């Protein structure tokens, strides 16, 4: 069946250079298909009114690089300072609760998801023996937008956003901010991407962990 | 005497009407903020308040069992049809699992913060949770910023209104960038709080009420 809810997400992680990646922040925006089929506009795009959201910070065991600390604006010490544990059972219960609130099937959407977000999410969940609904699929907007453009450049969020909306995203550089920016980009090309999703979305069960 | 809270969970409800019609939650948003973010409010180089970077957020929409009022649908921008079109169930087990997971991610004790909470948000949340037999963490306390701010102003000494919008306009002299939504209203509330953080933290430390002492608005 077609996915009924699209769950846009972004992860911020550290420790990748050690091949010991550990999520520091995750943000998810859940949007029903109908909202994407029929975008709202004020003349510019605005986000759907009916939108579920979950943003959770986690103190990673491994440190950010100074480049990824200036951008994201996190430090491992500061997440600790605000009293956050790591990616644990409580994160899993919250996430699974959140996903159960969505009409299935779910399509996870992440920019550069196949190379970063999805295998990273997969590693953390498998570490905790946690599974998503077996009908869950996922969509990486990076190859989608490349693929679509070829059917007729930089493919970063920053660049894509500037090329579709004339201006720079005032969205803070965070997981939540990045998902905001991604959802707008998706909305701007929604009929194409919905079509891409129907034909190209990958089963979540196919996704392999880092490990 | 209330415990010292380590996490302040700012929340707003968008409901289907006023108390007299046994309203239901159509939207809940929560912003969880560690006490230290409130004790030292971060400001950009231009010197204006900004939101804390370590900020957990949860926003959930729900289709009510009974209809909206005309006014509530207008205020909230939600309707039963739209929530139903988007496949949202009512306030159910899944909502409770998500909320309880979210709260368990916070360093306790937790102080819930809601504007006009003692009269509306807390008794409404209490009704919905009690209907499902759900409990919050044992030492949870509550702060209502409306009587808190009125009380602080009486001691410290305008202006007349203590509505959320009035307070934001007075303190920041601009319209909120909020979306006239639960999340937008929590955002507006957190900024109001930050504007008077040490006063309100002190108030909470001595005046915050036990969640366990909150009564349901009605029997569902």
Numbering used by the authors:
A (entry chain B): 5 to 46, 49 to 158, 168 to 226
B (entry chain A): 3 to 159, 166 to 228
From the paper:
The crystal structure of apo-mTREX2 was solved at 1.9 Å resolution. The structure reveals the assembly of a TREX2 dimer in the asymmetric unit, with a two-fold symmetry axis at the center of the dimer interface, and the homodimeric conformation is consistent with the solution state of mTREX2 by gel-filtration analysis. Formation of the dimer is important for the cooperative DNA binding and the exonuclease activity of TREX proteins, such as TREX1 and TREX2 (3,34–36). Each monomer only consists of protein molecule without any metal ions. The residues of the active site, Asp14, Glu16, Asp123, Asp193 and His188, aligned well with those of E. coli RNase T and Exo X which are the typical members of DEDDh exonucleases, suggesting their structural conservation. The absence of metal ions in the structure of apo-mTREX2 suggests the metal ions are stabilized upon the binding of substrate DNA to mTREX2 during catalytic process.
The three prime repair exonuclease 2 (TREX2) is an essential 3′-to-5′ exonuclease that functions in cell proliferation, genome integrity and skin homeostasis maintenance. TREX2 belongs to the family of DEDDh exonuclease, which was named after the four invariant acidic residues and one general base residue in the active site, consisting of more than 17 000 members involved in various DNA and RNA metabolism pathways. The exonuclease activity of TREX2 is responsible for removing the 3′-mismatched sequence of duplex DNA and is associated with cell proliferation and DNA repair. In this study, we present four new crystal structures: apo-TREX2, TREX2 in complex with two different dsDNA substrates, and TREX2 in complex with a processed dsDNA product.
